[PDB]
Design a binder for this molecule. Structure first.
Ligand SMILES: *[C@@H]1O[C@H](CO)[C@@H](O)[C@H](O)[C@H]1NC(C)=O
Ligand SMILES: *[C@@H]1O[C@H](CO)[C@@H](O)[C@H](O)[C@H]1NC(C)=O
Ligand SMILES: [Zn+2]
Ligand SMILES: [Zn+2]
Ligand SMILES: [Zn+2]
Ligand SMILES: [Zn+2]
Ligand SMILES: [Zn+2]
Ligand SMILES: [Zn+2]
Ligand SMILES: [Zn+2]
Ligand SMILES: [Zn+2]
Ligand SMILES: [Zn+2]
Lengths: 103, 105
Protein backbone atom coordinates (compact mmCIF):
# COMPACT_ATOMS: atom_id res chain seq x y z
CA UNK A 1 0.00 0.00 0.00
CA UNK A 2 2.41 2.65 1.26
CA UNK A 3 4.87 4.09 -1.28
CA UNK A 4 8.35 4.90 -0.03
CA UNK A 5 11.81 5.45 -1.48
CA UNK A 6 15.15 6.35 0.09
CA UNK A 7 18.31 7.93 -1.28
CA UNK A 8 21.92 7.82 -0.09
CA UNK A 9 23.88 11.03 -0.19
CA UNK A 10 27.39 12.15 0.64
CA UNK A 11 26.75 13.17 4.25
CA UNK A 12 23.41 11.52 5.04
CA UNK A 13 20.44 9.54 3.83
CA UNK A 14 16.92 10.65 2.93
CA UNK A 15 13.71 8.58 3.10
CA UNK A 16 10.61 9.75 1.20
CA UNK A 17 7.19 8.35 2.13
CA UNK A 18 3.86 9.01 0.39
CA UNK A 19 0.94 7.76 2.51
CA UNK A 20 -2.52 7.02 1.17
CA UNK A 21 -5.00 9.86 0.85
CA UNK A 22 -6.21 11.11 4.23
CA UNK A 23 -3.74 8.93 6.14
CA UNK A 24 -0.64 9.99 8.05
CA UNK A 25 2.68 8.39 8.98
CA UNK A 26 4.52 8.20 12.29
CA UNK A 27 8.29 7.84 12.18
CA UNK A 28 10.22 5.93 14.80
CA UNK A 29 13.90 5.04 14.60
CA UNK A 30 14.84 1.55 15.81
CA UNK A 31 18.00 0.64 17.68
CA UNK A 32 19.32 -2.92 17.62
CA UNK A 33 17.44 -3.69 20.87
CA UNK A 34 14.05 -2.84 19.36
CA UNK A 35 13.58 0.55 21.02
CA UNK A 36 11.56 3.00 18.93
CA UNK A 37 12.77 6.62 19.00
CA UNK A 38 10.40 9.41 18.10
CA UNK A 39 11.93 11.97 15.73
CA UNK A 40 11.79 15.54 17.04
CA UNK A 41 12.20 19.04 15.64
CA UNK A 42 15.14 20.14 17.81
CA UNK A 43 17.49 17.36 18.91
CA UNK A 44 21.15 16.33 18.97
CA UNK A 45 20.57 13.19 16.92
CA UNK A 46 20.87 14.77 13.43
CA UNK A 47 17.54 13.52 12.10
CA UNK A 48 14.62 15.60 10.85
CA UNK A 49 11.05 15.28 9.57
CA UNK A 50 9.60 17.60 6.92
CA UNK A 51 6.67 17.74 4.50
CA UNK A 52 7.42 18.51 0.85
CA UNK A 53 5.36 20.68 -1.47
CA UNK A 54 3.51 17.45 -2.26
CA UNK A 55 1.89 15.32 0.43
CA UNK A 56 5.13 13.42 0.98
CA UNK A 57 7.02 13.22 4.27
CA UNK A 58 10.81 13.62 4.20
CA UNK A 59 13.02 11.94 6.81
CA UNK A 60 16.64 13.09 6.84
CA UNK A 61 19.42 11.39 8.82
CA UNK A 62 23.09 12.30 8.96
CA UNK A 63 25.55 9.43 8.61
CA UNK A 64 27.15 10.50 11.91
CA UNK A 65 23.83 10.63 13.78
CA UNK A 66 22.67 8.71 16.83
CA UNK A 67 21.32 5.40 15.55
CA UNK A 68 23.24 5.11 12.28
CA UNK A 69 25.42 2.02 12.64
CA UNK A 70 28.35 0.68 10.64
CA UNK A 71 27.91 -3.00 9.75
CA UNK A 72 30.01 -4.81 7.14
CA UNK A 73 31.40 -1.50 5.87
CA UNK A 74 28.05 0.20 5.19
CA UNK A 75 25.91 2.75 7.00
CA UNK A 76 22.66 1.10 8.13
CA UNK A 77 19.58 2.73 9.66
CA UNK A 78 16.33 0.97 10.59
CA UNK A 79 13.12 3.02 10.58
CA UNK A 80 9.51 2.03 11.33
CA UNK A 81 6.66 3.65 9.39
CA UNK A 82 3.23 3.80 11.07
CA UNK A 83 0.54 4.43 8.47
CA UNK A 84 -2.37 5.81 10.49
CA UNK A 85 -6.02 6.72 10.03
CA UNK A 86 -7.58 9.99 11.15
CA UNK A 87 -9.20 8.10 14.04
CA UNK A 88 -5.72 7.37 15.42
CA UNK A 89 -5.58 3.65 14.57
CA UNK A 90 -2.54 2.04 12.96
CA UNK A 91 -3.63 0.83 9.53
CA UNK A 92 -0.23 -0.75 8.81
CA UNK A 93 3.36 -0.79 10.04
CA UNK A 94 6.38 -1.00 7.75
CA UNK A 95 10.01 -1.54 8.73
CA UNK A 96 12.65 -0.12 6.38
CA UNK A 97 16.39 -0.78 6.50
CA UNK A 98 18.39 2.01 4.85
CA UNK A 99 21.77 0.81 3.55
CA UNK A 100 24.41 3.18 2.18
CA UNK A 101 28.05 2.61 1.15
CA UNK A 102 31.03 3.94 3.10
CA UNK A 103 34.87 3.83 2.89
CA UNK B 1 13.34 43.86 -7.92
CA UNK B 2 15.54 41.59 -5.75
CA UNK B 3 17.99 43.99 -4.10
CA UNK B 4 18.27 42.54 -0.60
CA UNK B 5 21.58 43.36 1.09
CA UNK B 6 23.16 40.55 3.09
CA UNK B 7 26.59 39.37 4.19
CA UNK B 8 27.98 36.75 6.54
CA UNK B 9 30.77 36.92 9.11
CA UNK B 10 32.96 34.08 10.36
CA UNK B 11 33.63 33.93 14.11
CA UNK B 12 35.39 31.71 16.65
CA UNK B 13 32.62 29.20 17.50
CA UNK B 14 30.07 30.09 14.84
CA UNK B 15 29.12 32.31 11.95
CA UNK B 16 26.51 35.06 11.57
CA UNK B 17 24.36 35.81 8.53
CA UNK B 18 23.10 39.39 8.42
CA UNK B 19 20.23 40.51 6.22
CA UNK B 20 18.88 44.05 6.00
CA UNK B 21 15.42 44.01 4.41
CA UNK B 22 13.91 47.24 3.16
CA UNK B 23 10.46 48.82 3.11
CA UNK B 24 9.05 46.99 6.11
CA UNK B 25 9.98 43.54 4.80
CA UNK B 26 11.36 40.57 6.71
CA UNK B 27 13.57 37.56 6.03
CA UNK B 28 13.00 33.90 6.87
CA UNK B 29 16.05 31.64 6.77
CA UNK B 30 16.01 28.07 5.45
CA UNK B 31 18.90 25.61 5.53
CA UNK B 32 19.38 23.50 2.40
CA UNK B 33 20.71 19.96 2.67
CA UNK B 34 22.34 18.01 -0.14
CA UNK B 35 18.92 16.58 -1.13
CA UNK B 36 17.41 20.01 -1.78
CA UNK B 37 15.24 19.89 1.35
CA UNK B 38 14.57 23.21 3.09
CA UNK B 39 14.63 23.43 6.91
CA UNK B 40 13.18 26.68 8.24
CA UNK B 41 15.27 28.10 11.05
CA UNK B 42 13.84 28.43 14.56
CA UNK B 43 15.63 28.99 17.86
CA UNK B 44 17.29 25.65 18.66
CA UNK B 45 20.14 25.66 21.18
CA UNK B 46 20.93 21.97 20.75
CA UNK B 47 21.37 22.52 16.99
CA UNK B 48 23.22 25.80 17.66
CA UNK B 49 21.26 28.15 15.46
CA UNK B 50 19.42 31.24 16.63
CA UNK B 51 17.45 34.15 15.20
CA UNK B 52 17.84 37.77 16.24
CA UNK B 53 16.86 41.24 15.11
CA UNK B 54 19.50 43.81 15.92
CA UNK B 55 18.76 47.22 17.34
CA UNK B 56 18.81 48.26 13.67
CA UNK B 57 16.50 46.74 11.05
CA UNK B 58 18.85 43.82 10.39
CA UNK B 59 17.90 40.17 10.82
CA UNK B 60 20.62 37.92 12.25
CA UNK B 61 20.95 34.18 11.71
CA UNK B 62 23.65 32.71 13.96
CA UNK B 63 24.95 29.17 13.48
CA UNK B 64 27.57 27.48 15.61
CA UNK B 65 30.32 25.75 13.65
CA UNK B 66 29.45 22.49 15.42
CA UNK B 67 25.72 22.84 14.72
CA UNK B 68 23.78 19.96 13.25
CA UNK B 69 23.25 21.22 9.65
CA UNK B 70 26.89 22.34 9.37
CA UNK B 71 29.23 20.20 7.27
CA UNK B 72 33.00 20.03 6.94
CA UNK B 73 34.10 20.29 3.30
CA UNK B 74 37.73 20.89 2.25
CA UNK B 75 38.61 21.69 5.85
CA UNK B 76 35.95 24.41 6.05
CA UNK B 77 32.59 24.70 7.78
CA UNK B 78 29.89 24.98 5.10
CA UNK B 79 26.21 25.87 5.40
CA UNK B 80 23.95 26.53 2.42
CA UNK B 81 21.14 28.94 3.28
CA UNK B 82 18.14 30.26 1.38
CA UNK B 83 16.97 33.78 2.23
CA UNK B 84 13.27 34.38 1.68
CA UNK B 85 12.54 38.10 1.46
CA UNK B 86 8.95 38.39 2.69
CA UNK B 87 6.23 40.96 3.14
CA UNK B 88 4.37 40.98 6.43
CA UNK B 89 1.47 39.28 4.63
CA UNK B 90 3.67 36.17 4.31
CA UNK B 91 4.42 36.27 0.57
CA UNK B 92 7.95 35.66 -0.70
CA UNK B 93 9.06 38.63 -2.81
CA UNK B 94 12.43 37.04 -3.65
CA UNK B 95 14.68 34.10 -2.76
CA UNK B 96 18.47 34.20 -2.43
CA UNK B 97 20.87 31.26 -2.09
CA UNK B 98 24.03 31.89 -0.08
CA UNK B 99 26.73 29.37 0.80
CA UNK B 100 28.43 30.29 4.05
CA UNK B 101 31.99 28.99 4.15
CA UNK B 102 34.17 29.53 7.22
CA UNK B 103 36.94 30.33 7.59
CA UNK B 104 36.91 32.43 4.42
CA UNK B 105 38.76 31.06 1.34
C1 LIG C 1 8.11 21.33 13.90
O1 LIG C 1 7.48 22.59 14.13
C2 LIG C 1 6.48 22.93 13.16
C3 LIG C 1 5.99 24.31 13.51
O2 LIG C 1 6.90 24.98 14.38
C4 LIG C 1 5.37 21.88 13.16
O3 LIG C 1 4.44 22.18 12.12
C5 LIG C 1 5.95 20.49 12.95
O4 LIG C 1 4.93 19.51 13.10
C6 LIG C 1 7.07 20.22 13.95
N1 LIG C 1 7.68 18.92 13.69
C7 LIG C 1 7.56 17.87 14.52
C8 LIG C 1 6.75 18.10 15.76
O5 LIG C 1 8.10 16.79 14.28
C1 LIG D 1 16.28 33.21 20.19
O1 LIG D 1 17.66 33.15 20.53
C2 LIG D 1 18.30 34.44 20.56
C3 LIG D 1 19.76 34.18 20.86
O2 LIG D 1 19.92 33.36 22.01
C4 LIG D 1 17.64 35.34 21.60
O3 LIG D 1 18.21 36.64 21.50
C5 LIG D 1 16.13 35.44 21.35
O4 LIG D 1 15.51 36.14 22.42
C6 LIG D 1 15.54 34.03 21.24
N1 LIG D 1 14.08 34.05 21.08
C7 LIG D 1 13.34 34.57 20.08
C8 LIG D 1 14.07 35.23 18.93
O5 LIG D 1 12.12 34.50 20.10
ZN1 LIG E 1 16.35 8.17 -5.57
ZN1 LIG F 1 18.27 6.62 -8.52
ZN1 LIG G 1 2.76 6.51 16.66
ZN1 LIG H 1 19.03 9.69 14.23
ZN1 LIG I 1 29.29 41.86 9.39
ZN1 LIG J 1 39.52 34.56 18.90
ZN1 LIG K 1 8.89 31.25 6.92
ZN1 LIG L 1 17.71 22.79 12.88
ZN1 LIG M 1 9.17 29.65 1.76
Amino acid sequence: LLQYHYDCGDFGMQLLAYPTRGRTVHFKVLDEFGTRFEVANCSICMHWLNTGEDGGLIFSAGYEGCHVLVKDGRYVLRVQLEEMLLSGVVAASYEVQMTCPRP
